[PDB]
Amino acid sequence: SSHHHHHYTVTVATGSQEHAGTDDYIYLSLVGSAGCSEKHLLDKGSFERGAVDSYDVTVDEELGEIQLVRIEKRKYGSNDDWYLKYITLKTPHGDYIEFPCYRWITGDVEVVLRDGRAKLARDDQIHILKQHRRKELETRQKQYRWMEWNPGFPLSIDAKCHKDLPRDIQFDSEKGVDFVLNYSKAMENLFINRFMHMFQSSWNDFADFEKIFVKISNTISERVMNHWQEDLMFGYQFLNGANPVLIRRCTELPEKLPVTTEMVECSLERQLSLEQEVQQGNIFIVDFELLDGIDANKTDPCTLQFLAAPICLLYKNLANKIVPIAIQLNQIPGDENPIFLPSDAKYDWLLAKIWVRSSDFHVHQTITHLLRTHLVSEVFGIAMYRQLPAVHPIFKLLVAHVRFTIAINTKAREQLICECGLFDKANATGGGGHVQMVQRAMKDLTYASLCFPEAIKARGMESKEDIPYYFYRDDGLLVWEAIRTFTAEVVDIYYEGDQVVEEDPELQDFVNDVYVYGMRGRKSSGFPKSVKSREQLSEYLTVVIFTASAQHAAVNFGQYDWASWIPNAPPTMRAPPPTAKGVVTIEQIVDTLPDRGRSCWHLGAVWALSQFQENELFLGMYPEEHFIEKPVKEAMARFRKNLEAIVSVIAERNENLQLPYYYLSPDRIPNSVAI
């Protein structure tokens, strides 16, 4: 695809996208320490998609060391956008200089690119480079401003629809990544259009839903189908499901749950008492205080949707497996909030489990998944684009991990979770309830909650010896330390010491745009207002990236496996929680379960949101060479080797498991949060 033009040897790399070529005029200038260059007109032929064009440009006079490159595109007619990858120069004196672009040029502005050697402001001392940097930040801050989408929410990009973002942060495709289009296209692909708007109609039994499900089911999905009524599967999801972040070891029984040793005698397997067992550390808890006060979806007057705020008490049996031993569906005990038990009627216990699952699904969708992953990543991205110039070593590193984050969130807000959005179709927290969740969850979000080892230890889930079957933790720690090592290497490459980090003005303003605008300047978040050490900078970028890639994928890509069997992850409930024991029948649960119309939308949503791209970039795949220097390439190479080793470790582990756990295998962890 190489084309040579003959009258400095200039090589321009055009993008591989479906539209990266442009037929407009492209003029080029070389800005040197001893002079500037005329606007040289490139070939008249249109730059092609995936192209690499070479041109001979003769300078009238010695320009000295080439520092900057101006690129202008003037429309020949009907101006179309052009994705520039990089520009290489082979100078007369025998020097090869690479300028990474990787940006959309739509004629609107003249783009100015700098050498691919990563630089800190402290390194720049001449008017040429400094003016470029200052002006670059001026326009970055003109282009990337903050906005509050909903009160108490983290600040997001200033835009109403997708087309309102800078194209550099838009999707490569016009309508390529669309919630409406991909969800409906799945509902057709999954062969479920007949139920797309078939509300107020209930599935007559499990068998009917099962016959449609077998043809679309997966491995983990079919296991869920065969084992969703088992205490073992119920407890297993609390460690290795799609939302394995809520369980905490119980060191003292909550006073609000008046559970008794005599109540759990049958589940207990050590001849110890319930309190004695808590003293031993074998009792675990999942408390849904965050669902108390959430308003259920009232958008459908012909169906009442209901939430709960359960407290689930679980036990680690002689097999070192965590299984549920007690469930109270609401927060304040009484005569109408029974504590259901595995000894109760089959369907009392089953309905308790169904409600616990529904609550976990609501938390996952809103708190675990959206807020703590997407919106955090978007905050980091907006701060990045505002405060770190493209020549900064932190920008070159994070740009690949915040790719498609702003755009996916904006598309969500314009199609998915807006007022009367697709979210309200099947979820009971539509109409505003989920909004309140985020607000209430905000004050619980802290910088330590995003640091993985601290987060694991904070709930007491640290000991692999006492809690051996926590694969999510085991893989997460491997990946976290891998990324920490990679980030440490980069930091050490670019910061002589803590003084250089501390004196870095653009890093500090980036951190502060995260603290003030991202977290709203809330003191109780724990976010650094300034980084003064390389260990702290490493940890900060580690939080950023791990939230943007590994954690996000762990919370997203278990949705079709585990939520696909609706009884295992109900998006809504159509009856209030049972207030008495021995009064509920399997039929009544089927009637409490979602209708046929919401079924299709939930299934399509989890399937569409559970998808990898055909040419997706996984952890370490950095095709866009923003870094072009040798030491940083070696650091990336080591990153890749350690990741591949972890892939081997995780595969060998999966070979000996009932149900393998592949979500934290780096070969399935994208770079950024694109869904």
Query: Could you give the CA distance from residue 199 to residue 304 in angstroms, rounded to a whole number?
Result: 12
Count, residues near Fe ion per rule CB under 5 A: 2
Give 273's contacts (C-beta < 8 A, 6+ positions apart): 261
Nearest residue (CB) to Fe ion, 217 versus 556: 556
Nearer Cβ to Fe ion (243/282): 243
Q: Which two tokens stand for residue 372?
A: 């703590």
Q: Which of 85, 353, 434, 552 binds Fe ion (CB under 5 A)?
A: 552
x/- contact string, 315-354, with Fe ion (CB under 5 A)?
Answer: ----------------------------------------
Query: Closest CB to Fe ion among 264 and 376?
Result: 376
CB of 374 to Fe ion, least distance (A): 6
Q: What number of helices (H) and strands (E) belong to the chain?
A: 23, 16
* Nearest residue (CB) to Fe ion, 118 versus 554: 554
Where b means 16+ CB within 10 Å and e means fewer, 135-170 reads ebbeebeebbebeebeeebbbbbebeebeebbbbbb
| Nearer residue to Fe ion within complex by CB, 26 or 569 | 569
> Of the two residues 87 and 555, which places its CB atom closer to Fe ion in the complex?
555
The residue type found at 614 is: E
Applying CB under 5 A, which part among 343-351, 467-475, 556-564, 584-592 lies near Fe ion? 556-564
Cα distances (angstroms) measured from residue 459 to each of 22, 249, 285, 415, 616:
54, 6, 10, 36, 34
β-strand partners of 84: 14, 103
Minimum distance, C-beta of residue 269 to Fe ion, in the bound complex (Å): 37
CB nearer to Fe ion: pick between 398 and 673: 673
Other CB atoms within a 10 A radius of the CB of residue 188 amount to: 12
Beta carbon of residue 371, minimum distance to Fe ion (angstroms, whole number): 11
User: Which residue's CB comes closest to Fe ion?
Assistant: 556
Least distance from Fe ion to the Cβ atom of residue 192, Å? 23
Q: With respect to Fe ion, which residue has the nearer C-beta, 386 or 552?
A: 552
Query: Residue 370 CB, nearest distance to Fe ion (Å)?
Result: 8
The partner residues of 315 in beta bridges, in order of sequence, read: 283, 323
- Determine, following the binding rule CB under 5 A, whether residue 473 of this chain makes contact with Fe ion: no
Q: Could you tell me which of 416, 422, 374 has the C-alpha nearest to residue 553?
A: 374
Query: Considering only 56-64, 306-314, 553-561, 638-646, which stretch makes contact with Fe ion by CB under 5 A?
Result: 553-561
Q: Which is nearer to Fe ion, 374 or 574 (CB)?
A: 374
Taking contact as CB under 5 A, which single stretch among the options 50-58, 193-201, 546-554, 622-630 is the one that binds Fe ion? Answer: 546-554
249 near Fe ion (CB under 5 A): no
**Quick one: 556 or 568, whose CB is closer to Fe ion?**
556
Complex with Fe ion: residue 285 or 370, whichever CB lies closer: 370
| Interface region with Fe ion, contact rule CB under 5 A, candidates 103-111, 197-205, 341-349, 547-555 | 547-555
Mark the segment that binds Fe ion (CB under 5 A) among 62-70, 104-112, 449-457, 551-559: 551-559
Q: Any idea of the CA torsion for 94, 100, 104, 107, to the nearest 10 degrees?
A: -30
Comparing CA positions, the residue from 335, 347, 315, 323 lying closest to residue 258 is: 335
Contact predicate 303/435, CB 8 Å: no
The string of DSSP letters for 133-199 reads HHHHHHHHHHHS-EEESSTTSPEEES-SSGGGS-GGGS-SSSSSS-HHHHHHHHHHHTT-GGGTT-T
From the list 617, 599, 596, 598, the residue with the least C-alpha distance to 670 is: 617
Compute the least distance from the CB of residue 372 to Fe ion, in Å: 10
In terms of phi and psi (left: phi > 0; alpha: psi -120 to 50; beta: otherwise), the region of 404 is left
Stretch that binds Fe ion, among 181-189, 221-229, 456-464, 549-557 (CB under 5 A): 549-557
Residue 553 CB, shortest distance to Fe ion, in Å, is 7
Q: Least distance (Å) from Fe ion to the CB of residue 552? A: 5
- List, in order, residues 6 or more apart from 16 with CB less than 8 Å away: 49, 50
Q: Is residue 556 part of the contact set for Fe ion (CB under 5 A)?
A: yes
CA proximity to 543, closest of 518, 506, 522: 518
CB 379 within 8 A of CB 673: no
Shortest Å, Cβ 608 to Fe ion: 12
CB of 604 to Fe ion, least distance (A): 16
Nearest distance, CB of residue 529 and Fe ion, angstroms: 28
Q: What is the CA radius of gyration of the chain?
A: 28
Stretch that binds Fe ion, among 14-22, 219-227, 550-558, 576-584 (CB under 5 A): 550-558
Smallest distance, Å, CB 404 to Fe ion? 12
Cα atoms found within 13 Å of the Cα of residue 112, Cβ hemisphere only: 18
Residue 62 CA to residue 60 CA, distance in Å, equals 7
Task: Tell me how far, at minimum, the Cβ of 631 lies from Fe ion, in Å.
Answer: 33
Closer residue to Fe ion, CB minimum distance, 267 or 556: 556
Closest CA to 264 of 249, 282, 248, 247: 282
Q: Which stretch binds Fe ion (CB under 5 A): 223-231, 335-343, 545-553, 592-600?
A: 545-553
In the bound state with Fe ion, the residue whose beta carbon lies nearer, of 317 and 556, is 556
Binding region for Fe ion (CB under 5 A): 552, 556
